[PDB]
Amino acid sequence: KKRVVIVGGGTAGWMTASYLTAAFGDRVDLTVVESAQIGTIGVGEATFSDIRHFFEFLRLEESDWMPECNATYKLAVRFENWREPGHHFYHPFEQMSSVDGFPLSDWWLRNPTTSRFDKDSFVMTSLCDAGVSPRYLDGSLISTIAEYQGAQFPYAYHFEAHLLAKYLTGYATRRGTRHIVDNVVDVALDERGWISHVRTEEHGDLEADLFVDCTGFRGLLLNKALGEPFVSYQDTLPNDSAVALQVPEPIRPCTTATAQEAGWIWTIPLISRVGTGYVYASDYTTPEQAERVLRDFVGPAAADVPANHIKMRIGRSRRSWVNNCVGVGLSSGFVEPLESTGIFFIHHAIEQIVKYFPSGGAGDDRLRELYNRSVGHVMDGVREFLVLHYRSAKRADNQYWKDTKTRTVPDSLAERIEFWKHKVPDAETVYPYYHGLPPYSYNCILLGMGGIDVNYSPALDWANEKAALAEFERIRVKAEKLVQELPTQNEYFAAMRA
């Protein structure tokens, strides 16, 4: 009978408790200890293509939780002004078809229907441009995380972080999770360096077979108590700061990432407000200037809203599971939210905690090794993907954007980029370990950002293009039909609440 103690009551702590509750029911003992004094990070409002697995694993329907979390649909990230002023493109959550053995991006490079690869190749692009729900009013859409990401439309969500945490708190406590409001004030280690207990101020000492560090950037257990080194990603991704605001027509079904002079601004539309933030590199602009740029970007509704200034710890713990302690969430690592991967890292982590859950006996070192390899691959792969956003962005208007082309690139990515100049990204040339990103994602960024010239495959000069023309026409016909038929998110969620 295993006991798990989760330290931290942010999104990471309550996702962990709820997921473990859904996986193990009352057969594993779960305790969350969270501080009333120490706040959560206060952001984290957009998700990634994994996310439908999480809510379905909890056996929750969208109507169960979306109204309570002011949640909306996220069908894509909309990138504005990365290639050039006034240009936008999408990374949509939608599989890219292959025709006669070549991805649609290859055919598009040879014979584009329009100048917009995303518009020609994915229906979700038109839904985002039109501002419609992916689901009809009758509810219809137009087991592992990986399998859910393989769905035709593996869409995601926007939500209020605090409301999701409160929702998941009720979900987990109603299903047996013990909820302690207290500070962990000491982490006691035994002679072999394992955690023997966490000491609280008022609830005594908590023992467990597994301690989950969900304490955020501070990494109280994994980093402080166990001394696990942290590996910076700042050589390749200099953005180290953010300033965020919550500020009270069709709701656009995507996150917007609008490139700025020293970083980029997110727009996350919720049911009753917008979450917004400027992620920036402090070497290139000040917190004062970044807040000014953000408030100016939002406009007069951002006048007297309080700013949340955040210094980010960018990188990952060398190992996320050390002895009897596993870091989940910001304690394990973090990269800038350009593709909204933080909750994906949490979700992946907790799926892997279940997968590699220890017995207490033989094999546990190998299970921990596999766990650590899996989470390290996800973060290292995503880091490559994020670097590609900056390395392929065409804009070069100032020192910041010029430096994206000269700074460190992971060596393996540099080689992939050289291949991608003549073969569009595919399974052979993408980071080969699971990191949540199928090849179409790389295609969307590479072609959208527009800074690297990509050649279509010479074979397409001799292949008959009839099937490819037919597939582009099918997508165009479907997109124009869907845009006329689907309701807005406003109407959809009004009916859901009703």
Tokens of 372: 């650590």
Q: Find the binder of a copy of itself among 126, 374, 392, 441 (CB under 8 A).
A: 374
Q: Find the binder of ligand FAD among 9, 263, 376, 438 (CB under 6 A).
A: 9
The Cβ-side half-sphere exposure at 268, using a 13 Å CA radius, reads: 27
Q: Find the binder of ligand FAD among 330, 413, 447, 479 (CB under 6 A).
A: 330
Q: Find the binder of ligand FAD among 18, 31, 40, 324 (CB under 6 A).
A: 40
Is 402 annotated as ligand-binding?
A: no
Q: Choose the binding region for ligand FAD from 2-10, 76-84, 362-370, 475-483 (rule: CB under 6 A).
A: 2-10
What CA–CA distance (Å, rounded) separates 141 from 496? 14
Is 340 annotated as ligand-binding?
A: yes
Residue 160, phi then psi, degrees to nearest 5: -75, 120
- Are the CB atoms for 287 and 279 separated by under 8 Å? no
Q: Find the binder of ligand FAD among 41, 69, 145, 302 (CB under 6 A).
A: 41
Tokens of 495: 């009916």
Q: Find the binder of a copy of itself among 95, 98, 173, 258 (CB under 8 A).
A: 98
| Helix, strand, coil % over all residues of the chain, rounded to 5 | 40, 20, 40
In this complex, which beta carbon is closest to a copy of itself, that of residue 43 or of residue 172? 172
Q: Of 2, 74, 119, 394, which residue is the catalytic one? A: 74
Q: Name which of ligand FAD, a copy of itself, none residue 342 binds, using a CB cut-off of 5 to 8 Å depending on partner kind.
A: ligand FAD
In this complex, which beta carbon is closest to ligand FAD, that of residue 99 or of residue 243? 243
SS (H, E, C) 358-400: CCCCCCHHHHHHHHHHHHHHHHHHHHHHHHHHHHHECCCCCHH
What CA–CA distance (Å, rounded) separates 272 from 48? 21
The yes or no reply on residue 111 touching a copy of itself (CB under 8 A) is no
The yes or no reply on residue 430 touching ligand FAD (CB under 6 A) is no
Q: Choose the binding region for ligand FAD from 29-37, 67-75, 428-436, 439-447 (rule: CB under 6 A).
A: 29-37
Is 311 noted as a catalytic residue in this protein?
Answer: no
Residues just before a chain gap in the chain (C–N exceeding 2.5 Å) are: 142, 248
The yes or no reply on residue 168 touching ligand FAD (CB under 6 A) is no
What CA–CA distance (Å, rounded) separates 384 from 398? 23
Instruction: Enter the DSSP assignment of 271.
Output: S
Q: Which of 147, 225, 160 is nearest to 187 (CA)?
A: 225
The yes or no reply on residue 216 touching ligand FAD (CB under 6 A) is yes
Residues that bind ligand FAD (CB under 6 A): 7-13, 33-35, 38, 40-41, 43-47, 161, 183-184, 214-216, 218, 220, 242, 244, 277, 310, 312, 329-331, 337, 340, 342-343, 346
Q: Which residues are annotated as a binding site for FAD?
A: 9-12, 38, 41, 43, 46, 184, 330, 340, 343
Q: Which residues are annotated as a binding site for L-tryptophan?
A: 339
